[model samples]
Target: SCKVPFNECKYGADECCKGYVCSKRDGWCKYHIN
Candidate 1:
């Protein structure tokens, strides 16, 4: 069977305060580009 981690981070940023993207499931900020 396949299982997903509940604590898995849905958002990860490639860059800092620069270009960012928001995740719908995790609702976190992620970098568009680094």
Candidate 2:
């Protein structure tokens, strides 16, 4: 697991991290929690 970067999308479309996605509104990539 790793922390996401800034200025990147948070959940979808051009996300920052792998296995994670850019959450746009949050402005960062976050781990997909189930």
Candidate 3:
């Protein structure tokens, strides 16, 4: 998982982990497993 103050990412950016997404509103990459 990305740490706090996460890195930015694009649509196909590899900044997110596998199974995670580059969520824009959150301004970071995160997992949608909630």
Candidate 4:
């Protein structure tokens, strides 16, 4: 997905950019600190 924060993204894939993680909660990329 390579989506930005708060952008819609797909789960189980490297679609999110830096500081972004694809969550199943809302199916959108969000900031998640590891």
Number of backbone collisions per candidate: 0, 9, 0, 2
Query: Compared with the true structure, what per-residue lDDT tens digits does model 1 show for residues 1-34?
Result: 2112332324553332434555566655544422
lDDT, candidate 3, equals: 0.59
Cα lDDT, model 1, residue 9: 28
lDDT of 3 by residue, 1-34 (tens): 4333256666656645666766666656676642
Regarding TM-score, does 1 or 4 come out ahead? 4
lDDT of 4 by residue, 1-34 (tens): 3556665777766857866667787877777643
Rank candidates by TM-score, best first: 4, 2, 3, 1
Cα RMSDs, all models: 10.0, 4.8, 4.2, 2.6
Question: Each candidate's lDDT (Cα)?
Answer: 0.42, 0.56, 0.59, 0.69
Judged by lDDT relative to the true structure, which candidate is superior, 3 or 4?
4
Error of 2 at 27 (Å): 0.6
Candidate 2 segments exceeding 4 Å error: 1-15
TM-score of each model, paired residue for residue: 0.35, 0.39, 0.37, 0.54
Name the best candidate (by TM-score).
4
Best to worst by lDDT, what's the order? 4, 3, 2, 1
